[PDB]
Design an enzyme around this catalytic site. Structure first.
Site, PDB file in Angstrom:
ATOM      1  N   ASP A   5      35.021  44.702  40.101  1.00  0.00           N
ATOM      2  CA  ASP A   5      33.997  44.704  41.150  1.00  0.00           C
ATOM      3  C   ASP A   5      33.334  46.066  41.258  1.00  0.00           C
ATOM      4  O   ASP A   5      34.014  47.092  41.270  1.00  0.00           O
ATOM      5  CB  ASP A   5      34.632  44.517  42.530  1.00  0.00           C
ATOM      6  CG  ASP A   5      35.455  43.265  42.682  1.00  0.00           C
ATOM      7  OD1 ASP A   5      35.980  42.726  41.687  1.00  0.00           O
ATOM      8  OD2 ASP A   5      35.618  42.853  43.856  1.00  0.00           O
ATOM      9  N   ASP A  50      33.101  41.184  37.421  1.00  0.00           N
ATOM     10  CA  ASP A  50      33.383  40.555  38.713  1.00  0.00           C
ATOM     11  C   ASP A  50      32.189  40.816  39.624  1.00  0.00           C
ATOM     12  O   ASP A  50      31.087  41.112  39.150  1.00  0.00           O
ATOM     13  CB  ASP A  50      34.765  40.978  39.261  1.00  0.00           C
ATOM     14  CG  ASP A  50      35.413  39.900  40.135  1.00  0.00           C
ATOM     15  OD1 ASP A  50      34.803  39.480  41.140  1.00  0.00           O
ATOM     16  OD2 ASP A  50      36.544  39.460  39.822  1.00  0.00           O
ATOM     17  N   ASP A  51      32.392  40.673  40.931  1.00  0.00           N
ATOM     18  CA  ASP A  51      31.277  40.768  41.863  1.00  0.00           C
ATOM     19  C   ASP A  51      30.518  42.079  41.698  1.00  0.00           C
ATOM     20  O   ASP A  51      31.101  43.155  41.529  1.00  0.00           O
ATOM     21  CB  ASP A  51      31.781  40.661  43.302  1.00  0.00           C
ATOM     22  CG  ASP A  51      32.147  39.247  43.686  1.00  0.00           C
ATOM     23  OD1 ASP A  51      31.384  38.321  43.333  1.00  0.00           O
ATOM     24  OD2 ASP A  51      33.188  39.052  44.353  1.00  0.00           O
ATOM     25  N   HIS A 111      30.033  38.493  38.511  1.00  0.00           N
ATOM     26  CA  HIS A 111      30.142  37.258  39.279  1.00  0.00           C
ATOM     27  C   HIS A 111      29.107  37.157  40.394  1.00  0.00           C
ATOM     28  O   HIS A 111      29.208  36.264  41.245  1.00  0.00           O
ATOM     29  CB  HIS A 111      31.567  37.073  39.818  1.00  0.00           C
ATOM     30  CG  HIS A 111      32.599  36.880  38.749  1.00  0.00           C
ATOM     31  ND1 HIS A 111      33.934  36.677  39.032  1.00  0.00           N
ATOM     32  CD2 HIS A 111      32.497  36.882  37.399  1.00  0.00           C
ATOM     33  CE1 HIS A 111      34.604  36.546  37.901  1.00  0.00           C
ATOM     34  NE2 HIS A 111      33.757  36.659  36.894  1.00  0.00           N
ATOM     35  N   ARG A 164      26.096  34.242  46.023  1.00  0.00           N
ATOM     36  CA  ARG A 164      27.310  33.547  46.434  1.00  0.00           C
ATOM     37  C   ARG A 164      27.749  33.970  47.829  1.00  0.00           C
ATOM     38  O   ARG A 164      27.737  35.157  48.164  1.00  0.00           O
ATOM     39  CB  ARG A 164      28.458  33.809  45.446  1.00  0.00           C
ATOM     40  CG  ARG A 164      29.813  33.295  45.945  1.00  0.00           C
ATOM     41  CD  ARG A 164      30.839  33.179  44.845  1.00  0.00           C
ATOM     42  NE  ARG A 164      31.225  34.480  44.317  1.00  0.00           N
ATOM     43  CZ  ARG A 164      32.273  34.662  43.524  1.00  0.00           C
ATOM     44  NH1 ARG A 164      33.028  33.636  43.175  1.00  0.00           N
ATOM     45  NH2 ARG A 164      32.546  35.868  43.066  1.00  0.00           N
ATOM     46  N   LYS A 222      31.325  33.165  49.911  1.00  0.00           N
ATOM     47  CA  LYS A 222      32.653  32.570  49.784  1.00  0.00           C
ATOM     48  C   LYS A 222      33.464  32.893  51.027  1.00  0.00           C
ATOM     49  O   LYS A 222      33.667  34.070  51.362  1.00  0.00           O
ATOM     50  CB  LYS A 222      33.383  33.039  48.519  1.00  0.00           C
ATOM     51  CG  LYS A 222      33.096  34.476  48.095  1.00  0.00           C
ATOM     52  CD  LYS A 222      33.988  34.909  46.918  1.00  0.00           C
ATOM     53  CE  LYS A 222      33.556  36.267  46.387  1.00  0.00           C
ATOM     54  NZ  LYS A 222      34.557  36.811  45.432  1.00  0.00           N
TER      55      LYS A 222
END
Length: 336
Positions: free
Chosen positions: A154, A175-176, A197, A230, A232
């Site tokens: 991340d 990742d993010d 991500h 996104r 979540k």
């Protein structure tokens, strides 16, 4: 007082007596933090050359800076090189070797970080837990992790923070690009995110702080990533997400979900069944456009019962891939 340090021990011993701290080509001992916490207000910190880190399996952080009215700068050509392939094993923070988080900005308040380049982080990069902190012209170069086993890399993890502004970030990771776990008055603008991500609110839930309020993610590009936009929220958790705006986001090469908002999230795998303890209200998407890959889904909304309301979606157009047949509890004025 201006001071130039070529070793970590000298910098730590004298940091409070220096108002300008230059860190030149420091090799940070294995298993230790380059500990620049506790700085005197007004101090400027300049990273020069290549900062490196010894190998050890531990949790980090590799670097930590704190104080009020601190100006952190990367000099032209400077790099903080984690040489993360020494740890990478495809498992990130989920298994395998214990890998150190890179850069803590915990109570780096009324401060700025500008022009820092991070190369090959072992795992997550910035842990932001501060008030009134700007991060400008940051580069995260974890491209080697695409083929060498990088995971959970991340770029910007945010929690328990207010007035965070990230401007002109350039991220290539696994990742993010941003993950807002909690915080109020957050801005991410002008960013380019690839490999990872996507631009994420969350995960929200399961921590001490589970409140997200007034976040704008805008004027940014997401390419070659699992998700574009996104949100979540954690399965069965309690919290809230309100006043979030994604505006002028372009995406392409997205492999899983162009836009995904789901309330069944767990780190290992989502459950497939949403819960309603983390309401998502006053969500605005404006001009979120682009394309997903042939095997991807354009838009997926998995809301719990009553926990998604008052959304405004305009000029949302995601082409390619397939339409979802699994959306649940879609609010008024929104569609998959």
């Amino acid at each position: 007082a201006s001071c130039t340090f070529t070793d970590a021990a000298s910098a730590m011993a004298s940091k409070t007596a220096c108002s300008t701290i230059t860190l030149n080509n420091i090799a940070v001992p294995a298993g230790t933090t380059l500990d620049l916490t506790g700085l005197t207000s007004g101090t400027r910190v300049i990273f020069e050359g290549t900062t490196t880190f010894g190998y050890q399996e531990w949790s980090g952080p590799l670097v930590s800076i704190s104080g009020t009215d601190i100006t952190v700068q990367g000099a032209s050509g400077s790099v903080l090189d984690g040489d993360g392939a020494r740890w990478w094993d495809g498992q990130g923070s989920n298994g395998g070797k214990t890998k150190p988080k890179f850069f803590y900005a915990h109570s780096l308040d009324s401060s700025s970080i500008t022009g820092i380049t991070i190369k090959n982080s072992p795992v997550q990069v910035f842990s932001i837990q501060s008030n009134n902190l700007s991060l400008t012209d940051i580069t995260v170069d974890d491209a080697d992790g695409d083929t060498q086993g990088g995971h959970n890399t991340d770029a910007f993890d945010i929690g328990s923070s207010t007035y965070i502004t990230i401007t002109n970030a350039n991220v290539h990771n696994q990742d993010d690009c941003i993950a807002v776990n909690s915080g109020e008055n957050i801005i991410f603008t002008g960013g380019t995110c690839t490999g990872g991500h996507g631009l994420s609110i969350g995960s929200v839930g399961g921590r001490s702080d589970n409140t997200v309020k007034n976040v704008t993610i805008e004027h940014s590009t997401v390419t070659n990533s699992q998700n574009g936009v996104r949100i979540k929220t954690v399965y069965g958790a309690t919290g809230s997400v309100s006043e979030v705006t994604y505006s002028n986001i372009q995406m392409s090469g997205i492999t899983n979900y162009g836009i995904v908002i789901e309330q069944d999230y767990e780190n290992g795998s989502p459950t497939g069944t949403p819960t309603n303890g983390v309401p998502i209200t006053d969500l605005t998407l404006n001009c979120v456009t682009g394309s997903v890959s042939s095997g991807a889904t354009e838009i997926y909304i998995l809301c719990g019962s009553g926990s998604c309301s008052s959304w405004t979606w305009t000029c949302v157009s995601i082409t390619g891939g397939s339409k979802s047949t699994k959306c649940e509890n879609v609010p008024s004025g929104v569609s998959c």
